[PDB]
Amino acid sequence: QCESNPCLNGGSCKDDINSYECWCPFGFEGKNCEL
Amino acid sequence: VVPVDYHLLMMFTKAEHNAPLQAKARVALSSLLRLAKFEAHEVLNLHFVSEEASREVAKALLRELLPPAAGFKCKVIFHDVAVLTDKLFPVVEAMQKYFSAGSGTYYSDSIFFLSVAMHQIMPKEIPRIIQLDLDLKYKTNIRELFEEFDNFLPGAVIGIAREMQPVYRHTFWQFRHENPKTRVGDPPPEGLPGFNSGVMLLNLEAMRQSPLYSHLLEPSWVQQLADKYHFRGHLGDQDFFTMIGMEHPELFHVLDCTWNRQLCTWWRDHGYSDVFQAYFRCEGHVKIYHGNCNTPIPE
Ligand SMILES: O=c1ccn([C@@H]2O[C@H](COP(=O)(O)OP(=O)(O)O[C@H]3O[C@H](CO)[C@@H](O)[C@H](O)[C@H]3O)[C@@H](O)[C@H]2O)c(=O)[nH]1
Ligand SMILES: *[C@@H]1O[C@H](CO)[C@@H](O)[C@H](O[C@H]2OC[C@@H](O)[C@H](O)[C@H]2O)[C@H]1O
């Protein structure tokens, strides 16, 4: 299994190889939507 | 008295040296068997999909729980995950690119789509089967769930409960962005939040006999709908049924939340605090608890 991609764009798995940008759900920031 | 068969199916793989999985299976099967009641001519058929090591583990657990306290007839059947994987692959290959972790099309993912093609895998003598996760706790007689088949409207092929987290609100973001007004990914009572695969009433005869369902299995239809919805996932059969359910809700008999009360709150803490409650709300007498995402089940 993989961990769900917290970003709204790109693949369903976190750290999708073909993805570069990460747009986070409102209220969250970071390359993994942490803070 | 002609014998009437009831069929359940559970995935039980990679169980050796997997204590958490064994403990979940123990809770599921003990509760199931303790609370089950069937008439004298009836037989409960328990199908397990397992490689050889987990088959041995399952046998050891079942001998501790069988015969059931209620004294009804119970038959245990094992199916080889490797055999089923090869039977599944032709049918299921095209969807794996969209709904498997992560990329591309691997035999190891094929079994997560068993339910979608169950009507082609199980013998013709089996008209219906209920596929069940092993991280469940039963609070009623499983015989009662079979009456839900009676409530299928013409054209419905599968009985399934809605997903109780906003995972599909998240997954369908792009489609939701391009279609502001859509019900796709919204919470109940009027949104389509998607489905959870923990409890599934697979009417194999209805699946076999549906022109629509058969078409939706075709590679070009999978691709067309995945493209329409900008939809990718990694939860296997759950994602496929969720997607075709957006386009063709008529195919699904929606079970009440009490038949699959999901406990996972992972998505609450990953961006959906605001709306989480509208998805997670379930009230009424709980029939089956579901400890998904490794969530301890209360007592
Ligand atoms: O090593 C394993 C893991 C799972 N299972 C079986 O698979 C079921 C599903 O896994 P579970 O641990 O119960 O995960 P959930 O969080 O309930 O399920 C989510 O994650 C699953 C695995 O990716 C997806 O298949 C589901 O559609 C999705 O809802 C289990 O109940 C078991 O029956 C095994 O046999 N061996
Ligand atoms: C995203 O990844 C996380 C961490 O791996 C999973 O816990 C999420 O799955 C959970 O929520 C959606 C439910 O449908 C699953 O049954 C549950 O495990 C996954 O969406």
Ligand SMILES: [Mn+2]
């Ligand atoms: Mn589960």
